Amino acid sequence: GHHHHHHLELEVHIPSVGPEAEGPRQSPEKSHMVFRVEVLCSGRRHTVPRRYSEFHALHKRIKKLYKVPDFPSKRLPNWRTRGLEQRRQGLEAYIQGILYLNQEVPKELLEFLRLRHFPTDPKASNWG
C-alpha cells in the first residue's frame, strides 16, 4: 500500500498473561500458559495470545537472521516465586526490541499467524 505514515502511533505491550494455552506436541517447555501480546503500530493494534514456545522459537530463528537481542530461556521457573510481570516484561522487551531495531513486528510472525490487519480485543486496555 502507499500512504503517508503521518500517524506513527507505536505502542507495544503485553496486557495480559493467563493459563489457557494450547497444549502442543513434545516441546522443550509445553507451557500451558500464555501471554497475550499487543503490538500497536501505525494506529493498528493487534492483540495476540502466544504460548512461550512460539516466541521462544521465533526469537531463536531470527536471532540468527536479523538484529535481535537476548533470547528467552527454555527452562523457566514455575512462576510461583515472582509474578507474571517478569515473564511479560521479558518477552515484551525482546519483541519490542527487534521491533525498534530493524524489521518492526517480525514479518515471520506476520506470516505465522497471518497477523496482517489482525484483530484486537476490547479487553486489552485499561481505561481505553
Using H for helix, E for strand and C for coil, what is the string for 8-70? CCEEEEEEEEECCCCCCCCCCCCCCCEEEEEEEECCEEEEEEEEHHHHHHHHHHHCCCCCCCC
- The boundaries of the domain holding residue 44 are 1-128
| Ligand-binding site membership of 74 (annotated) | yes
C-alpha 10/C-alpha 86 separation (Å) is 22
What method was applied to determine this entry?
A: NMR
- N residues, the chain: 128
One-letter amino acid of 48: V
Nearest to 13 by CA among 99, 107, 112: 99
| Ligand-binding site membership of 51 (annotated) | yes
Name the grid cell of 99.
521491533
What is the CATH number for 58? 3.30.1520.10
Tally of structural domains, the chain: 1
6-41 burial, b if ≥16 CB within 10 A, otherwise e? eeeeeebbbbbbeeebeeeeeeebebebbbbbbbbb
Quote the crossing angle between the two packed helices 52-62 and 85-101, to the nearest 10°. 30
Would you say 53 and 31 are in contact if contact means Cβ atoms under 8 Å apart?
yes
